[PDB]
Design an enzyme around this catalytic site. Sequence first.
Site, PDB file in Angstrom:
ATOM      1  N   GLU A 130      28.980  13.323  38.639  1.00 29.98           N
ATOM      2  CA  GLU A 130      28.398  13.145  37.259  1.00 29.98           C
ATOM      3  C   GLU A 130      29.660  13.043  36.213  1.00 29.98           C
ATOM      4  OE1 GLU A 130      26.284  16.527  35.212  1.00 29.98           O
ATOM      5  OE2 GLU A 130      25.259  14.955  34.299  1.00 29.98           O
ATOM      6  N   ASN A 171      35.215  32.331  34.739  1.00 26.79           N
ATOM      7  CA  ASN A 171      36.358  31.743  35.235  1.00 26.79           C
ATOM      8  C   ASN A 171      37.762  32.408  34.976  1.00 26.79           C
ATOM      9  OD1 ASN A 171      33.868  30.015  35.499  1.00 26.79           O
ATOM     10  ND2 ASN A 171      34.317  28.645  34.032  1.00 26.79           N
ATOM     11  N   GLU A 194      50.288  34.802  56.579  1.00 24.70           N
ATOM     12  CA  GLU A 194      50.491  36.207  57.148  1.00 24.70           C
ATOM     13  C   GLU A 194      49.208  37.017  56.787  1.00 24.70           C
ATOM     14  OE1 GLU A 194      53.654  37.908  55.182  1.00 24.70           O
ATOM     15  OE2 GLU A 194      54.036  39.609  56.444  1.00 24.70           O
TER      16      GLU A 194
HETATM   17  N1  LIG Z   1      63.774  50.929  55.146  1.00 23.85           N
HETATM   18  C1  LIG Z   1      63.325  49.750  54.843  1.00 23.85           C
HETATM   19  N2  LIG Z   1      62.243  49.053  55.263  1.00 23.85           N
HETATM   20  C2  LIG Z   1      61.844  47.862  54.857  1.00 23.85           C
HETATM   21  C3  LIG Z   1      62.444  47.219  53.969  1.00 23.85           C
HETATM   22  N3  LIG Z   1      61.616  46.173  53.616  1.00 23.85           N
HETATM   23  C4  LIG Z   1      60.805  46.164  54.477  1.00 23.85           C
HETATM   24  N4  LIG Z   1      60.696  47.377  55.366  1.00 23.85           N
HETATM   25  C5  LIG Z   1      59.686  47.609  56.224  1.00 23.85           C
HETATM   26  O1  LIG Z   1      59.811  46.665  57.321  1.00 23.85           O
HETATM   27  C6  LIG Z   1      58.429  46.583  57.764  1.00 23.85           C
HETATM   28  C7  LIG Z   1      58.055  45.080  57.760  1.00 23.85           C
HETATM   29  O2  LIG Z   1      59.173  44.307  58.461  1.00 23.85           O
HETATM   30  P1  LIG Z   1      59.800  43.137  57.432  1.00 23.85           P
HETATM   31  O3  LIG Z   1      58.922  42.996  56.256  1.00 23.85           O
HETATM   32  O4  LIG Z   1      61.168  42.966  57.224  1.00 23.85           O
HETATM   33  C8  LIG Z   1      59.075  41.950  58.877  1.00 23.85           C
HETATM   34  P2  LIG Z   1      60.187  40.255  59.211  1.00 23.85           P
HETATM   35  O5  LIG Z   1      60.689  39.829  58.075  1.00 23.85           O
HETATM   36  O6  LIG Z   1      60.978  40.802  60.386  1.00 23.85           O
HETATM   37  O7  LIG Z   1      58.879  39.670  59.962  1.00 23.85           O
HETATM   38  P3  LIG Z   1      57.834  38.494  59.283  1.00 23.85           P
HETATM   39  O8  LIG Z   1      56.752  39.620  58.931  1.00 23.85           O
HETATM   40  O9  LIG Z   1      57.484  37.428  60.168  1.00 23.85           O
HETATM   41  O10 LIG Z   1      58.683  37.951  57.826  1.00 23.85           O
HETATM   42  C9  LIG Z   1      57.545  47.379  56.888  1.00 23.85           C
HETATM   43  O11 LIG Z   1      57.285  48.615  57.576  1.00 23.85           O
HETATM   44  C10 LIG Z   1      58.283  47.474  55.616  1.00 23.85           C
HETATM   45  O12 LIG Z   1      57.973  48.759  54.851  1.00 23.85           O
HETATM   46  C11 LIG Z   1      63.600  47.677  53.204  1.00 23.85           C
HETATM   47  O13 LIG Z   1      64.430  47.252  52.401  1.00 23.85           O
HETATM   48  N5  LIG Z   1      63.961  49.250  53.980  1.00 23.85           N
HETATM   49  N1  LIG Z   2      30.630  31.268  37.557  1.00 23.93           N
HETATM   50  C1  LIG Z   2      30.387  29.893  37.156  1.00 23.93           C
HETATM   51  N2  LIG Z   2      29.362  29.340  37.933  1.00 23.93           N
HETATM   52  C2  LIG Z   2      29.105  28.118  37.479  1.00 23.93           C
HETATM   53  C3  LIG Z   2      29.758  27.347  36.385  1.00 23.93           C
HETATM   54  N3  LIG Z   2      29.039  26.225  36.224  1.00 23.93           N
HETATM   55  C4  LIG Z   2      28.233  26.031  37.088  1.00 23.93           C
HETATM   56  N4  LIG Z   2      27.944  27.109  37.709  1.00 23.93           N
HETATM   57  C5  LIG Z   2      27.031  27.650  38.923  1.00 23.93           C
HETATM   58  O1  LIG Z   2      26.708  26.586  39.618  1.00 23.93           O
HETATM   59  C6  LIG Z   2      25.289  26.385  40.248  1.00 23.93           C
HETATM   60  C7  LIG Z   2      24.950  25.032  40.289  1.00 23.93           C
HETATM   61  O2  LIG Z   2      25.833  24.192  40.967  1.00 23.93           O
HETATM   62  P1  LIG Z   2      26.685  23.008  40.003  1.00 23.93           P
HETATM   63  O3  LIG Z   2      28.285  23.224  40.310  1.00 23.93           O
HETATM   64  O4  LIG Z   2      26.455  23.193  38.351  1.00 23.93           O
HETATM   65  O5  LIG Z   2      26.054  21.725  40.605  1.00 23.93           O
HETATM   66  P2  LIG Z   2      27.130  20.525  40.884  1.00 23.93           P
HETATM   67  O6  LIG Z   2      28.103  20.924  41.705  1.00 23.93           O
HETATM   68  O7  LIG Z   2      27.734  19.871  39.337  1.00 23.93           O
HETATM   69  O8  LIG Z   2      26.111  19.253  41.542  1.00 23.93           O
HETATM   70  P3  LIG Z   2      24.731  18.944  40.960  1.00 23.93           P
HETATM   71  O9  LIG Z   2      23.613  20.080  41.630  1.00 23.93           O
HETATM   72  O10 LIG Z   2      24.247  17.466  41.132  1.00 23.93           O
HETATM   73  O11 LIG Z   2      24.763  19.148  39.409  1.00 23.93           O
HETATM   74  C8  LIG Z   2      24.559  27.136  39.109  1.00 23.93           C
HETATM   75  O12 LIG Z   2      23.737  27.899  39.623  1.00 23.93           O
HETATM   76  C9  LIG Z   2      25.693  28.007  38.332  1.00 23.93           C
HETATM   77  O13 LIG Z   2      25.325  29.306  38.524  1.00 23.93           O
HETATM   78  C10 LIG Z   2      30.714  28.047  35.868  1.00 23.93           C
HETATM   79  O14 LIG Z   2      31.358  27.556  34.837  1.00 23.93           O
HETATM   80  N5  LIG Z   2      31.003  29.548  36.386  1.00 23.93           N
HETATM   81 MG   LIG Z   3      26.538  18.163  39.308  1.00 21.71          MG
END
Ligand SMILES: Nc1nc2c(ncn2[C@@H]2O[C@H](COP(=O)(O)CP(=O)(O)OP(=O)(O)O)[C@@H](O)[C@H]2O)c(=O)[nH]1
Ligand SMILES: Nc1nc2c(ncn2[C@@H]2O[C@H](COP(=O)(O)OP(=O)(O)OP(=O)(O)O)[C@@H](O)[C@H]2O)c(=O)[nH]1
Ligand SMILES: [Mg+2]
Lengths: 437, 437, 429, 429
Positions: free
Chosen positions: B67, B224, B250
Amino acid sequence: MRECISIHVGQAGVQIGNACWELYCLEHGIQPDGQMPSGGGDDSFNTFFSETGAGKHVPRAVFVDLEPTVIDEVRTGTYRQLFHPEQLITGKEDAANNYARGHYTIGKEIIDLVLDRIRKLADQCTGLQGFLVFHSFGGGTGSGFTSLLMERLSVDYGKKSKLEFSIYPAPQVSTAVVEPYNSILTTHTTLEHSDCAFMVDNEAIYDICRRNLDIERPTYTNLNRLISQIVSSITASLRFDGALNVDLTEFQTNLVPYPRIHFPLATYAPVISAEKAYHEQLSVAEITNACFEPANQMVKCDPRHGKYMACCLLYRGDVVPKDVNAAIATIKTKRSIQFVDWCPTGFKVGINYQPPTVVPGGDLAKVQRAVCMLSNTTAIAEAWARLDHKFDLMYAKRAFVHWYVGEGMEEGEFSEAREDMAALEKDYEEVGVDSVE
Amino acid sequence: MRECISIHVGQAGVQIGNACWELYCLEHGIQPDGQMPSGGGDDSFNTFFSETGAGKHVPRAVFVDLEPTVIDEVRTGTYRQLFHPEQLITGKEDAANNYARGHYTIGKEIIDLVLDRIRKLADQCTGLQGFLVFHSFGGGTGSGFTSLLMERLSVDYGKKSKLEFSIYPAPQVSTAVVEPYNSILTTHTTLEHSDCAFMVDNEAIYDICRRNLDIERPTYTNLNRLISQIVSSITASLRFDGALNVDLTEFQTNLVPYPRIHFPLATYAPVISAEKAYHEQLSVAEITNACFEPANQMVKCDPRHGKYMACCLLYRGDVVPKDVNAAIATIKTKRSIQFVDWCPTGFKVGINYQPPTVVPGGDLAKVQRAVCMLSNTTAIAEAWARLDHKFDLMYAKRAFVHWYVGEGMEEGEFSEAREDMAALEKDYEEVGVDSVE
Amino acid sequence: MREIVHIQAGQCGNQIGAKFWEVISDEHGIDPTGTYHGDSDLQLDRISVYYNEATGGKYVPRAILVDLEPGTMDSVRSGPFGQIFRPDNFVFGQSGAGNNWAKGHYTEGAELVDSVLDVVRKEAESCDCLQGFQLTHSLGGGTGSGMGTLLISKIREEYPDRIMNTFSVVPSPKVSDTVVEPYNATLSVHQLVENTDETYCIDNEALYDICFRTLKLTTPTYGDLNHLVSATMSGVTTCLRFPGQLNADLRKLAVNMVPFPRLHFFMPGFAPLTSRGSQQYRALTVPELTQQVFDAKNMMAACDPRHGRYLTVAAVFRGRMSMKEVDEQMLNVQNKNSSYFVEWIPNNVKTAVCDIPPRGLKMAVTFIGNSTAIQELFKRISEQFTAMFRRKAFLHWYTGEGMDEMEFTEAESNMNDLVSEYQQYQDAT
Amino acid sequence: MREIVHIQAGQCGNQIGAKFWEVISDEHGIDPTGTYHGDSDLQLDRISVYYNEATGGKYVPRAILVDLEPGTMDSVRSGPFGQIFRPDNFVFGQSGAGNNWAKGHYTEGAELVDSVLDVVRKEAESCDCLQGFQLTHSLGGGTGSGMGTLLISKIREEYPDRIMNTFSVVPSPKVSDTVVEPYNATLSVHQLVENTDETYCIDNEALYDICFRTLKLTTPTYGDLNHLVSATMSGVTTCLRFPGQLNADLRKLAVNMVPFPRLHFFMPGFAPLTSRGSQQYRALTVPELTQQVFDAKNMMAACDPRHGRYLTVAAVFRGRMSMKEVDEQMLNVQNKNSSYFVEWIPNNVKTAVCDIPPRGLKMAVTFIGNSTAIQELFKRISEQFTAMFRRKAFLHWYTGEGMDEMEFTEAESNMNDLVSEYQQYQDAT
Ligand SMILES: Nc1nc2c(ncn2[C@@H]2O[C@H](COP(=O)(O)CP(=O)(O)OP(=O)(O)O)[C@@H](O)[C@H]2O)c(=O)[nH]1
Ligand SMILES: Nc1nc2c(ncn2[C@@H]2O[C@H](COP(=O)(O)OP(=O)(O)OP(=O)(O)O)[C@@H](O)[C@H]2O)c(=O)[nH]1
Ligand SMILES: [Mg+2]
Ligand SMILES: Nc1nc2c(ncn2[C@@H]2O[C@H](COP(=O)(O)CP(=O)(O)OP(=O)(O)O)[C@@H](O)[C@H]2O)c(=O)[nH]1
Ligand SMILES: Nc1nc2c(ncn2[C@@H]2O[C@H](COP(=O)(O)OP(=O)(O)OP(=O)(O)O)[C@@H](O)[C@H]2O)c(=O)[nH]1
Ligand SMILES: [Mg+2]
Ligand SMILES: [Mg+2]
Ligand SMILES: [Mg+2]
C-alpha cells in the site's frame, strides 16, 4: 711463599667472601682500591694478596655464581677495584635450589672456566699451602657446584689439602623446602674430597648474637663478620709470627685422628658487646672457660651429649704459655668436658702476637686477647640424625624427586647418599663408644 | 564496521521505523536533513548510518509496503531528506489482510526489487552482522511478504543472524477478523528462519502506559517510542563503549538454549512519568526489581505461570558491577521468580555508559540509569494457546478459507501450521519439567 | 637478561595487563612517552627484564596484546599508557567470538594464532636469555579461555623447556556475569593442567570481599581489582629485577612449590592492605605482615584454607627487614597452625627478601600458597557443568562451531582426576 | 492508484449520484466548474481516485449516468453540479420502460447497454490502476433493476477480478409506490447475489424513520434521504482518499466482511446523526458514536438486528481519535451483545481510522453490518411475490417482451436459497 687460594660459591659463599676480604684488607691496612701506603705487615700480605709493579695488591680469590645478581653487586660495590675482573665469574641462571641443576646441566658450562682461573692462580703461586672453599649445603648452586669443583680439584691437586667452611641447615629454621635433598646429596662429595670441613648453623649464630651482643634481630652481615673473624683467626698463624705457630698440615695432623672423621666444630671468644666489655676483665682463664660452654657453640647441639676427641686452641693477642697451660689443666680437671680415654693429650695450643682486628662500625667490642677453638666431637651426629630424619620423612613419598630426575639425576643417588650418611653416623658413634685395654 | 540492516514491512513496521530512526538521529546528533554539525559520535553512527562524501548520513534501511499511502506519508514528512529515494519501496494494492495475497500473488513482483536493494546495502556493509525486521503478524503484508523475505534472506545469507521485533494479536483487543489465520501462517517461517523473535502486544503496552506513565488514552506513537527504546537498548552495546559489552552473537549464545526456543519477552525500566520521576529514586536495585514485575512484561502473560530459562540484563548509564551483582543475588534468592534447575546461572550482564535519550514531545522522563531486560520463559505458551483456540474456533467452520484458496494456497497449509504450533508449544512445556536425576 | 614475555588475551586480561604495565612503569620510572626519569641506577640495572631499549632512550614493553574484538584495543591505545606499547604488537580480529569456547579455539582463533605466534617469536628471538612467559586471561569467556589455551599449547610445543606462568580469573558462583561459564572453564582446565608450569587462580568474589572488608571501598570497580592483581604480579617478579638478601627465581619458586607435576594451582595474596583511616593507627612490621597474609580473609580465591591443608607456601618480602624476624615469625606460624600443614613435608615455607619496597611503602609481602582447599572451586564448577550437561543445555552452539560431546566428557573426567589427586594428598598420612 | 468508476441507473440512482458527487466535490474543494480551490495538499494528493485531470486544472468526475428516459438527465444537467460532468457520459434512451423488468433488461436494455459499456471501457482504460466499480439503482423499478443487472453481468464478464459494490434501494411493505415492486426485486436479487461482491441494502422506510425520529425533520424530501445515503458513500471510501492510522480499502473490507461467498448483503449506518436543536446538549465522543451506530433505530435497512445475529461488523472512523478507546468500546459492545454475535467467530469487528473528518463533523463513523436479520426483507418480498404470482393475470406484461414464468420460479427459488443459507448460519452452533 705460604699462600692459600680462596673460592666462594653461591650467594652465601660470595657474601661471606666480601666480609672476609673486608676483614683482611683492614688487618693488612690495604685501602679498598688496592694501594698500600704504610714488621709483620711487610710479608703478611703475600699470604692472601699478590703484588704487581704499580704497588697494587690483588686478592687471591675466585667468586662464582650461576646467577648474576650478587656478582653484579660486588662489581658495583665498594671493593670493585680490589678484585681482578677475571676472578669474578657469572653463569646465566641459578640452580633453583636443585642439586642436579647445579651439578650436571648448568655447572658444566662454567666449571671449565673456573678451573682455568684456579690453574692460573696456582701457577702464579709458589709454595702454595691450601684451598679454602665457602658455600652452603642448602643452596642448589652451592651444593652441586661445590661437589663438582671439589671432585675436579681433588683430581687436579690431590696432593694438597683442602679446607671447607660451609653453612648447615638448622633443625627448625629454614629458608628452602628442598634443603634436605641438596644437603644429603652433597655430604658424600664433601666427605670424600674434603680434608677438614667446619660446620656452621645460622640459628646458632642468631642465638649467640642475641645473648652476647644484645641484637634483637641481626642480619647476615653480622654472621658473615663472625665467620670472617674465625677464618682470620685460623689463618693468622701463617699470616703473622707467634710464640707457638701452627701450620695447616700440622693442625690437621693434630686434630684429625682418623681419615673420615674430619668434621670439627668452631667457636670464638670473647664475643661481647661494647657496653659489657668494660665491666669484665677478659682474662685468659675466663676466655678459655667461656669458649668451652655449650651456649657459645656455633652448631646448635650440646657437646655434653657427645665426647671430645681432639681440641685445637688458637690464641691471638697478649698471652703467655703459663696462663694457657694452667687454663688447659683446669679445663681437664672439670668432668663436664669428657675426653675420650684412648686419647691421653687432647689439646694443641698456638699463640700469636697480633691482636684481633675490629671492623669499623661493628657490633663486637675491641679486645686485646682472643681465642678460637676447633674441636672434634661426636655431638654433630645428632644434627646429622635430625637432617636424615627430615630427608627420609619426605623422601618416603617422593616429595620433589621429579625436579631432580628431570635434570638427569638418577633415583638411586638418594638411596646411596642416605646409606653413606648412615655409615658416617655409625662410624662417629662407633669410635667414641668405649675402649678397653 | 559492525553494521546492521533494518527492514520495515507493513504499516506497523514502517510506523515503528519512523520512531526508531527519529531516536537514532537524536542519539547520534544527526539532523533530519542529514548533516551532523557536532569522541563516541565519531563512529557510533557507523552501525546504523552510512557517510557520503558531502557529510550526509544515509540510513541503512529498507521501507516496503504494498500500500503506497504510509510510504508517501514518509516521503512527504519531516524525514524526506534523510532516506534514500529507492529504499522507500512501494506497490499499488494492499494485501487486504490476506496471507496468500501478500505471500504469493502480489509479493512476487516486488520481492526481487527488495532483495536487490538489500543486496546493495549488504555490499556497502563491510562488517555486517545481523538483520533487523519489523512487522505485524495480523496484517496480510506483514505476514506473507515478511515470510517470503525471511526465507529468501535465509537462503542468501544463511550464516548471518536474523532478529525480528513482531507485534502479536492481543488476547481480546483486535482490529481485524482474520488475525488468527495470518498469524498462524506466519509462525512457521518465524520459527524456522529467524534466529530471535521478540514478541510485543498492543494491549500490554496500553496497560503499561495507563499504569506507569499515567496517560489516560495511549496512542501508537508512544508504543512505537517504547519499542524504539527497546531496540536502542539492544544496539547500544554495539554502538557505544561499556564495561561489559554484548554483541548479537554473544546475546544469542547466552539466551537461546535450544534451536527452536528463541522467543524471549522484553521489558524496559524505569518506565515512569515526569511527575513520579522526581519522587522516586530509580536506583539499580529498584529498576532491577521493577523489571521482573508481571505488570511490565510487554506481552499479556504471567511470568509466574511459566519458569525463567535465561535472562539478559542490558544496563545503560551510571552503573557499577557491584550493584547489579547484588541485585541479581536478591532476585535469585527471591522465590516468586523461579528458574529452571538445569540453568544454575541464568543472568547475562551487559553495561554501557550512554544513558537513554528522551525524544522531544515525549512521555518518558529523563533518567540517568536504565535497564532493558530480555528473558526466555515458558509463559508465551499461554498466548500461543489462546491464538490456537481462536484459530480452531474459526477453522472448524471453514470461515474465511475461500479468500485464501482464491489467492493460491491449500487447506494443507492451515493444517500444517496448526500442527507446527502444537509441536512448538509441546516443546516449550517439555523443557520446563524438572530433571529426572 | 632473564627476560619474560607478557601476553594478554580477552578484555579482562587486557585490562589487567594495562594496570600491570602502569604499575611496572611507575616502579621503574618510565613515562607514558617511554623516556626514563627515575632516581636510582637499580631501576636501569635490570630494566631489560620487561622492556626493550629503542634508539633515543625510549623503552618499549615486551608485551603482546590479543583480542578478537578491537574495542578493547582502542581502549588500551586511548589509555593513559596507550602510547607506550608497540603498534605491531596489537593483533586483533573482527568479531568478539561470543562467549563460545569452540568459536574462540577452533574457528576464529585459528586465523589470529599464526600472527600472534609470529609476534611472540619475533619478541622471543629478540631476547638475550629468555626465562619464561606470562599470560592473563579469564576462564569464563570464549576468546580468553579458548584462544589462551590454544596459544599456551602452541608455545609449549615451540619452547618446551621454558617456564610458562598464568594468572587466571576463575568463574565464581556469586559474580556470574555469563550463562555459559562452566563449559568454558571446564574445557580450559584440561589444557591448563597439562600445558603450564604455574597457574595463579583469582576470584572476583574474593577481590570484592577484600575491597569491601579490608579497604572499605564504597563502590569498587574493576580498576581496583586489576590494581590488586597487578600488585601481586609485580610482587612475584621482584627478585629478577632488584637485588636482595635472598633471591627467588621463577624456577626456584616452581621447584619449591610444586611437589608433584600436576599440583601447581596456587592461591595468591598480598600484604599490607588497609584503609586510609586505618593506615595511620596500623603498626607496620613483619609480624603484622605475616599475620595478615596467613589470614584466610586476605586470600585471593573464594576458599577457606581451614578446610584443606597447605602443601607449600612462599613469601616474597620487599623492603628492608631483619630476616631473623622473618624466620622466627614464619616458624611460629608453622608451629601454632601445624594441623593446616601436611606432615610429609617438614618445612612447608619458602622465604625470599628483596631490598626495594613498592611505591613508598616501608615494606610489603606477596604470599603464594599451594593448598588442598583449591579443589572447592573445581567442585562447584563441575557441579554446574554436570547440571547443565545433563540436559544438553547450550551444546548446539558449540557443535555448530565443530566440537563434540566426547570432548566435554573428557574435560569433566580430567577435572575429576585433578580434584581426586588433591583430595588424595589431603587424605594422605 | 486504486481508482473507482461510478455508474448511475434510474431516477433514484441518478439523484443519489448527484448528491454523492455534490458531497465529494465539496469535500475535495472543487467548484461546480471543476476548478480546485482547496486548502490542504491532502485533498489533492489522491484526487485521482474519483476525478480525472483535464487541462487547465479542470477536474472531470469519473461518472457514468444511465437512464432510459431523458428528463432525469436534463434535471441533472440543470442541477447545481450539473455542468461538472462530462457530456459524453450522458447515455439516454427515449422511453422510460414503465416499471417493466423485461422491458428494462432485454428489449430496451440490449440497445443501450452497448454504448454504456463503450463509455465504461473508455473510462476504464483511462484509469491507471482500477480497483472496482460503484452502482446506484433501485430494485423496485424496471429500468434500474433490468439495466443494473444486465450491466453488472456484462461488466463482471469483462473484468472478473475487480470488486463491484452496489447500493440498492430495496422495496418495503410500507412505502410501496408501484405494484410490480415484488416482481422487479425478485427478478433482480438473483443477478445481485450472483454477480456482485458487495451489496448495501437501503430502505426508504428506514431513512424516513431516521429523518423523523432522529433529525426531527418536519417534511423530509428525497434530497435529505439521498444526502444521508451519500454520507455513507463518502464514508466507506475515505481510507483510499486520505491517510489514517488504520487503512481499510474495499478489498480489506470484503475480506473482513464475507466469510462465505454468497453472504455479502450488508446493512449500512452512520453517526453522529443529531438534530440541530439537540446537538448543543450532547458531548461528541467515541463511546457516544459507538453506542449510536449500534442502536437498532439507526439502521438504514428497516430490519431488527435483535431478531438475528451479527456475523461480522466494520467501523470506519474519521477524525483524530485514539484507538485503545475504539478497542475498549468495541470489546465492551461485543461483551454486551455477545448473545447477538456468533460464537464461531471470536472477533467480529473490523476497525479502521482516518485522520480527516467529513464536511462539518469533528468526528464521524460509518457502520457496516453483515447480520442474519437481513432475511426479513427477502421474506416480505417473497411473500408479496407469491401472493401476486398465485394469479397469472398480471404476468402478461412480462410475458410480452419475451420473458417466461420459469424465470419467475427460478428467481423465487434463488431468493429462498439465500434466506435458507442465512437462517442456517443463524442456527449454526
Ligand atoms: N577483574 C576483572 N574482571 C573482569 C574485567 N573485565 C571483565 N572481567 C570479568 O571477566 C569475565 C569475562 O571475561 P571477558 O569479558 O574478558 C571474556 P573474553 O573477552 O576473554 O572472551 P569473549 O566473551 O569471547 O569476548 C567476567 O566474569 C567479567 O566480570 C576487569 O577489568 N577486571
Ligand atoms: N503498536 C503498533 N501496532 C500497529 C501500528 N500500526 C499497525 N499496527 C498493528 O498492525 C495490525 C495490522 O497489521 P498491518 O501492519 O496494519 O497490516 P499491513 O502490514 O499494512 O498489511 P495489510 O493487512 O494488507 O494492511 C493491527 O492489528 C495493529 O494492531 C503501530 O503504529 N503501532
Ligand atoms: Mg497494509
Ligand atoms: N431515496 C430515493 N428514492 C427515490 C428517489 N426517487 C425515486 N425513488 C424511489 O425509488 C424507487 C424506484 O423509482 P425510480 O423512478 O428511480 C425507478 P427506475 O427509474 O429505475 O425505473 P423506471 O420506472 O422504469 O424508470 C421508487 O420507490 C421511488 O419512489 C430519490 O430521489 N431518492
Ligand atoms: N650465614 C649466611 N647464610 C646465607 C647467606 N646467604 C644465604 N645463606 C644461606 O643459604 C641458604 C640458601 O642457599 P643459597 O646458598 O643461598 O643458594 P645458592 O648458593 O644461591 O644456589 P641457588 O639455590 O641455585 O640460588 C639459606 O638457607 C641461607 O641459610 C648469608 O649471607 N650468610
Ligand atoms: Mg643462587
Ligand atoms: Mg571479550
Ligand atoms: Mg425512471
